[PDB]
C-alpha cells in the first residue's frame, strides 16, 4: 500500500521532469509535502504550485521549470546530528556548490544550510538538486 | 493428556495382529461404537445393538442399518435411486 506519501510525490514530479512536462499532478497532499515544495520553490527549482483542496487528502499541481535534476527522498527518516550532517551532504549532494538536503527540525522544515544557521539538526526528509 | 501418539481405540490390542490390521480396524471400531443422532427424536442416542441393528436409547426405535456404520453408502445411493424410479413410474 501507500506507506510513504512524500516518496510518491517526489518520484512523480521527478518522473514528469525527465519527460519534460510543464506541470505535474500529485494525488495526496500532506502538510510535509507543501512544506517540502516551498523549500524547493524558495530556491527556484520549481515554479508556482497550487493546492486543489477538496474535502479529502487534496491534490497539488506543481508548475515545473527545467531546473530540477533530481528530487529524491531518503527513507527512513534517519536522525541527523550536526556532526554527521557534513558526511551526509558529502555522499548525497552532487557538489559543494549547489544541491540541498531538506531535513525537519524542531524549528520546522528547511534545507541543510538553514539548519547550520539555526544550529539544530533533526530527521532527514529528502534532497534536491 | 493425550495418552497415545497414533494408536486410538485399538490400543487395547497391544502389540498383536500387526500394524496394518490394527490400523484398518481402527476406522471401523471407532464407527461401530460411535453414538449417532437419531433422525426421529434428534437426540444423539443411536447406538449399535448387534451387527446391522441400531437402537435409539431415547425414542426406543430400532433401525436396520449397516454392520459397522449407521448408514451404508451403498444403501443411501439405493434409497435415492429408488426414490427417482418411484416418481418416474407413477409420474
Amino acid at each position: 500500500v501507500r506507506m510513504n506519501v512524500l516518496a510518491d510525490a517526489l518520484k512523480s514530479i521527478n518522473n514528469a521532469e525527465k519527460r519534460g512536462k510543464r506541470q505535474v499532478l500529485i494525488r495526496p497532499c500532506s502538510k510535509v509535502i507543501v512544506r517540502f515544495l516551498t523549500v524547493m520553490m524558495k530556491h527556484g527549482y520549481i515554479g508556482e504550485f497550487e493546492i486543489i483542496d477538496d474535502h479529502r487528502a487534496g491534490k497539488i499541481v506543481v508548475n515545473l521549470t527545467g531546473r530540477l535534476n533530481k528530487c529524491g527522498v531518503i527513507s527512513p527518516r534517519f536522525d541527523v546530528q550536526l556532526k554527521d550532517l557534513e558526511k551526509w551532504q558529502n555522499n548525497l549532494l552532487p557538489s559543494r556548490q549547489f544541491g540541498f538536503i531538506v531535513l525537519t527540525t524542531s524549528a520546522g522544515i528547511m534545507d541543510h544550510e538553514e539548519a547550520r544557521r539555526k544550529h539544530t539538526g533533526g530527521k532527514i526528509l529528502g534532497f534536491f538538486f | 493428556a493425550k495418552r497415545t501418539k497414533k494408536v486410538g481405540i485399538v490400543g487395547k490390542y497391544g502389540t498383536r495382529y500387526g500394524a496394518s490390521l490394527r490400523k484398518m480396524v481402527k476406522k471401523i471400531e471407532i464407527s461401530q461404537h460411535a453414538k449417532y443422532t437419531c433422525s426421529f427424536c434428534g437426540k444423539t442416542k443411536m447406538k449399535r445393538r448387534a451387527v446391522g441393528i441400531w437402537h435409539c436409547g431415547s425414542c426406543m426405535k430400532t433401525v436396520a442399518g449397516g454392520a459397522w456404520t449407521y448408514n451404508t453408502t451403498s444403501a443411501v445411493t439405493v434409497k435415492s435411486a429408488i426414490r427417482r424410479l418411484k416418481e418416474l413410474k407413477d409420474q
Binding site: 527513507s75 527512513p76 527518516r77 534517519f78 | -
Partner: protein, 141 residues
C-alpha cells in the same frame, strides 16, 4: 539491503551473520574443519622427518618428474609430501634428516605443475637449503 526499516537492525544483522557462511573464504576460517585438516595446524612452518624420496609426475603438456620427499611431521605425526624446491637439491637431502618445511604460497592449494603437493623444503639439518645451493655452507658429517 532489501528492508530499510528504521528498527530492522536485528533483521539485517542476523542476515549477514547468516549469509556470511556462504562465503568460501570465511567459512574455512571460522570452522575447525579447515584447521584440523591442516597438517601444520595454523603454523607457518613445521619440522618433520624425511623417510623417502619420491618423484612426482607433472600433469598438463608441461611434462617432467618433480622431485619431492615424504615427510612425517614431529608435532602431529602426520605424513606430507614436501617439494624439494631448487635444481639438484635432492642430493643434499638424505633419509632420516629433520627438515624445516613451509607452505608453497597458495595457502593450502596445489601449485601449478605438481599435483597435490602443498609444501616445500626450506632448511635441511638446520642449515638453509639455499645456502647449500649457493655453496655458502655445506652439510656437516
Amino acid at each position: 539491503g532489501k528492508c530499510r526499516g528504521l528498527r530492522t537492525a536485528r533483521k539485517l544483522r542476523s542476515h549477514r551473520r547468516d549469509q556470511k557462511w556462504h562465503d568460501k573464504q570465511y567459512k574455512k576460517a571460522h570452522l575447525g574443519t579447515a584447521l584440523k585438516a591442516n597438517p601444520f595446524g595454523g603454523a607457518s612452518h613445521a619440522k618433520g622427518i624425511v623417510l623417502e624420496k619420491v618423484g612426482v609426475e607433472a600433469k598438463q603438456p608441461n611434462s617432467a618428474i618433480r622431485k619431492c620427499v615424504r615427510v612425517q611431521l614431529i608435532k602431529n605425526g602426520k605424513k606430507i609430501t614436501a617439494f624439494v624446491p631448487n635444481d639438484g637439491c635432492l642430493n643434499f637431502i638424505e633419509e632420516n634428516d629433520e627438515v624445516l618445511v613451509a607452505g608453497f604460497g597458495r595457502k593450502g592449494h596445489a601449485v601449478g605443475d605438481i599435483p597435490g603437493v602443498r609444501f616445500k623444503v626450506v632448511k635441511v639439518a638446520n642449515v638453509s637449503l639455499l645456502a647449500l645451493y649457493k655453496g655458502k655452507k655445506e652439510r656437516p658429517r
